[PDB]
Amino acid sequence: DKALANVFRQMATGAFPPVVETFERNKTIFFPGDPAERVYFLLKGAVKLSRVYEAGEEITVALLRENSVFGVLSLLTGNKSDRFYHAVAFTPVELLSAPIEQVEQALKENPELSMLMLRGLSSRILQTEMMIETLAHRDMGSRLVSFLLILCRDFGVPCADGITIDLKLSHQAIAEAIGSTRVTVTRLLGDLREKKMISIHKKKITVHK
Amino acid sequence: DKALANVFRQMPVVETFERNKTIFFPGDPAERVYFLLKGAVKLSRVYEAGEEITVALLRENSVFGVLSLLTGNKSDRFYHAVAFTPVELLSAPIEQVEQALKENPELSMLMLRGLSSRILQTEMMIETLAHRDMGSRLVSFLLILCRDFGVPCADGITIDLKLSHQAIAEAIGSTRVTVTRLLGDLREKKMISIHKKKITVHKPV
Ligand SMILES: CCCCCCCCO[C@@H]1O[C@H](CO)[C@@H](O)[C@H](O)[C@H]1O
């Protein structure tokens, strides 16, 4: 729509437009250690962004929803070459991507684009802060509940009993987000279901509240 | 430094806050934007269910109090900003910032670096808070302080801030006594030493 076409207009630099890319569920968009080459704009689906820290642990930093920008921190920084993030297609994803150097060029004396970028960084901050609340819980049960509520907000569809998260969710993908094992998540969701707090239909979780 | 002045010249009150004093409260609308000149600011977020959790430690040259505007929460912040140590800062009414973001082309470009820095600081608190044991959380938090406020040492890195056990506990979500005993254990192991209420980390490595 008009918003998307605007992004094309603000990103034109006399070479390629932003490219459409699609990724299947659970496919990696970019790996830590890989050259940080492109900036991404999420059109459909959910992206799990994680960071590999200095001691080497990988931790989810954000569950990015449609309209988010990512892969762009390096450009806004000093040092640039090497990605320390892992981006994964949490669900099937469609996005736009452009070389970092194109973004850097397009930003040049372009208040409209830097304002779009500012809103993007601000959304990234808010989403990272949601993961803070999730991971601050020392018990896995509460992390799982907080994570489900992120998904309710990002992808939830109202219904009689509550809110249906509008994605087919694997237990392993959930475990990876919250730093648990697939086995634990299956146990916890079973506990939640037996307590009548959630129901599951065709792999879509409905949270009753 | 020169960059912070640059952000300001695009966009008035000088204020000081003593240690632990609140700069702004959650539930209050965003009234001003703040440029931090001296000291440390602890930003925390109040979440829907009512828990308050640290989201960033801000150091000199940070700009804060503007996020809420950029995200449509000008009418009621869910952030709490506190002088983690005694602070000095410059502030401006948010209406003037709003005006500048709409007139001055170069302004939002100059703010991208500040927001990027905020993301990186929030991600450090992610790594700290994801630790389920308080000992690891404390150590991670001490390392954040070493990066953000550390001064190179023959002994190692000295965190150049005078911090109370209670302020540390609040930041990492622990009790005062837990932090006291953990710092005690770290001193017994020679991993840190404390002189004139300043912590030196001997090998952050
Ligand atoms: C295509 C690869 C380069 C990415 C830079 C694009 C910046 C996108 O910016 C975004 O555009 C959306 C649509 O209007 C908005 O709704 C967002 O709030 C905004 O941050």
mmCIF file of C-alpha atoms and ligand atoms in Angstrom, chain A residues 1-4 6-7 11 17-19 39-41 67-70 96-99 103 113 115-121 123, ligand 1:
data_model
loop_
_atom_site.group_PDB
_atom_site.id
_atom_site.type_symbol
_atom_site.label_atom_id
_atom_site.label_comp_id
_atom_site.label_asym_id
_atom_site.label_seq_id
_atom_site.Cartn_x
_atom_site.Cartn_y
_atom_site.Cartn_z
ATOM 1 C CA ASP A 1 0.000 0.000 0.000
ATOM 2 C CA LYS A 2 0.950 3.670 0.189
ATOM 3 C CA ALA A 3 3.235 3.123 3.196
ATOM 4 C CA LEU A 4 5.208 0.394 1.378
ATOM 5 C CA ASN A 6 6.857 5.258 0.215
ATOM 6 C CA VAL A 7 9.690 2.988 1.373
ATOM 7 C CA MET A 11 15.126 4.008 -0.708
ATOM 8 C CA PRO A 17 15.162 -1.079 -5.437
ATOM 9 C CA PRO A 18 14.779 -3.057 -2.166
ATOM 10 C CA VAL A 19 14.405 -6.700 -2.979
ATOM 11 C CA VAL A 39 19.215 -4.056 6.108
ATOM 12 C CA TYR A 40 15.818 -5.743 6.403
ATOM 13 C CA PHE A 41 12.219 -4.555 6.585
ATOM 14 C CA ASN A 67 6.842 -3.387 9.894
ATOM 15 C CA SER A 68 10.059 -3.813 11.949
ATOM 16 C CA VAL A 69 13.506 -2.950 10.678
ATOM 17 C CA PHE A 70 16.535 -5.029 11.540
ATOM 18 C CA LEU A 96 12.414 -6.291 1.875
ATOM 19 C CA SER A 97 16.164 -5.974 1.986
ATOM 20 C CA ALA A 98 18.778 -3.514 0.668
ATOM 21 C CA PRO A 99 22.542 -3.322 0.914
ATOM 22 C CA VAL A 103 20.622 2.593 3.053
ATOM 23 C CA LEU A 113 13.882 8.279 5.694
ATOM 24 C CA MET A 115 12.353 9.676 10.516
ATOM 25 C CA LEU A 116 11.092 6.266 9.285
ATOM 26 C CA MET A 117 14.366 4.772 10.604
ATOM 27 C CA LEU A 118 13.912 6.557 13.963
ATOM 28 C CA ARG A 119 10.431 5.019 14.338
ATOM 29 C CA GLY A 120 11.934 1.659 13.403
ATOM 30 C CA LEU A 121 14.645 1.904 16.061
ATOM 31 C CA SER A 123 9.868 -0.028 17.794
HETATM 32 C C1 LIG C 1 14.047 -2.164 2.173
HETATM 33 C C2 LIG C 1 15.268 -2.287 3.109
HETATM 34 C C3 LIG C 1 15.680 -0.979 3.855
HETATM 35 C C4 LIG C 1 14.926 -0.602 5.176
HETATM 36 C C5 LIG C 1 14.608 0.890 5.562
HETATM 37 C C6 LIG C 1 13.095 1.185 5.676
HETATM 38 C C7 LIG C 1 12.534 2.017 6.865
HETATM 39 C C8 LIG C 1 11.067 1.636 7.193
HETATM 40 O O1 LIG C 1 10.435 2.368 8.221
HETATM 41 C C9 LIG C 1 9.123 2.001 8.650
HETATM 42 O O2 LIG C 1 8.121 2.092 7.646
HETATM 43 C C10 LIG C 1 6.789 1.641 7.972
HETATM 44 C C11 LIG C 1 5.798 1.785 6.815
HETATM 45 O O3 LIG C 1 5.334 3.101 6.702
HETATM 46 C C12 LIG C 1 6.269 2.285 9.276
HETATM 47 O O4 LIG C 1 4.953 1.980 9.633
HETATM 48 C C13 LIG C 1 7.274 2.270 10.424
HETATM 49 O O5 LIG C 1 6.855 2.805 11.650
HETATM 50 C C14 LIG C 1 8.700 2.594 10.008
HETATM 51 O O6 LIG C 1 9.646 2.573 11.028
#
